[PDB]
Design a protein around this motif. Structure first.
Motif, PDB file in Angstrom:
ATOM      1  N   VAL A 175      13.568   7.954  15.134  1.00  0.00           N
ATOM      2  CA  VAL A 175      13.329   5.818  14.719  1.00  0.00           C
ATOM      3  C   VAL A 175      13.078   6.474  13.134  1.00  0.00           C
ATOM      4  O   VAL A 175      13.371   4.922  12.864  1.00  0.00           O
ATOM      5  CB  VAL A 175      11.753   5.326  15.030  1.00  0.00           C
ATOM      6  N   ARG A 176      11.965   6.365  12.906  1.00  0.00           N
ATOM      7  CA  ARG A 176      11.918   7.098  11.677  1.00  0.00           C
ATOM      8  C   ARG A 176      12.695   7.036  10.619  1.00  0.00           C
ATOM      9  O   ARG A 176      12.965   6.292   9.424  1.00  0.00           O
ATOM     10  CB  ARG A 176      10.708   8.211  10.932  1.00  0.00           C
ATOM     11  N   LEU A 186       4.729  13.319  26.076  1.00  0.00           N
ATOM     12  CA  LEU A 186       4.578  12.733  25.063  1.00  0.00           C
ATOM     13  C   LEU A 186       5.833  13.481  24.067  1.00  0.00           C
ATOM     14  O   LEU A 186       6.188  13.278  22.229  1.00  0.00           O
ATOM     15  CB  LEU A 186       3.420  13.494  24.203  1.00  0.00           C
ATOM     16  N   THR A 187       5.710  14.574  24.011  1.00  0.00           N
ATOM     17  CA  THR A 187       7.147  15.454  23.214  1.00  0.00           C
ATOM     18  C   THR A 187       8.111  14.461  23.218  1.00  0.00           C
ATOM     19  O   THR A 187       8.888  14.611  21.690  1.00  0.00           O
ATOM     20  CB  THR A 187       7.103  17.008  23.455  1.00  0.00           C
ATOM     21  N   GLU A 188       8.295  14.263  24.435  1.00  0.00           N
ATOM     22  CA  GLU A 188       9.955  13.732  23.988  1.00  0.00           C
ATOM     23  C   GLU A 188      10.230  12.218  23.442  1.00  0.00           C
ATOM     24  O   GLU A 188      10.524  11.685  21.834  1.00  0.00           O
ATOM     25  CB  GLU A 188      10.828  13.021  25.723  1.00  0.00           C
ATOM     26  N   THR A 189       8.946  11.738  23.564  1.00  0.00           N
ATOM     27  CA  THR A 189       8.162   9.847  22.837  1.00  0.00           C
ATOM     28  C   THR A 189       8.210  10.432  21.591  1.00  0.00           C
ATOM     29  O   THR A 189       8.937   9.726  21.070  1.00  0.00           O
ATOM     30  CB  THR A 189       6.866   9.640  23.244  1.00  0.00           C
ATOM     31  N   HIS A 190       7.765  11.293  20.995  1.00  0.00           N
ATOM     32  CA  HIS A 190       7.319  11.639  19.659  1.00  0.00           C
ATOM     33  C   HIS A 190       9.274  12.456  19.082  1.00  0.00           C
ATOM     34  O   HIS A 190       9.348  11.836  17.774  1.00  0.00           O
ATOM     35  CB  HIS A 190       6.070  13.238  19.622  1.00  0.00           C
TER      36      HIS A 190
END
Lengths: 51, 51
Positions: A39-40, A29-33
């Motif tokens: 993306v933002r 989830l860290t890398e996904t985040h």
């Protein structure tokens, strides 16, 4: 009593293994985040660059 | 089709811009006009008319 005890040591090891499982999930989830951070940025300059 | 540049990092944090200019950039109200005020920048009357 003895059975309870040995199952309590095993309970400690159990919860430690659970923590580790979670830590795997939290690296993921860290890398996904971080991806969503990138993306933002791409959406913001998609905002300007749409004009 | 207004130029809504991005100015911030969140919603509605933009500024609009407009541009309008060409040959027919002379006097007018909504359109320039016909014989006047459009060609006065495109086809200046000082041809033989002016005499």
């Amino acid at each position: 009593m003895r059975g309870q005890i040995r199952g309590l040591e095993m309970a400690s090891k159990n919860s430690q293994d659970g923590i580790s499982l979670i830590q795997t999930a939290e690296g993921a989830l860290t890398e996904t985040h971080a991806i969503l951070q990138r993306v933002r940025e791409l959406v913001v300059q998609a905002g300007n660059t749409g004009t | 089709k207004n130029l809504v540049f991005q100015i911030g990092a969140n919603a509605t944090q933009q500024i609009s811009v407009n541009i309008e200019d060409m040959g027919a950039d002379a006097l007018g109200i909504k359109e320039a006009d016909g014989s006047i005020a459009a060609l006065h920048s495109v086809n200046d009357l000082d041809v033989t008319k002016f005499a």
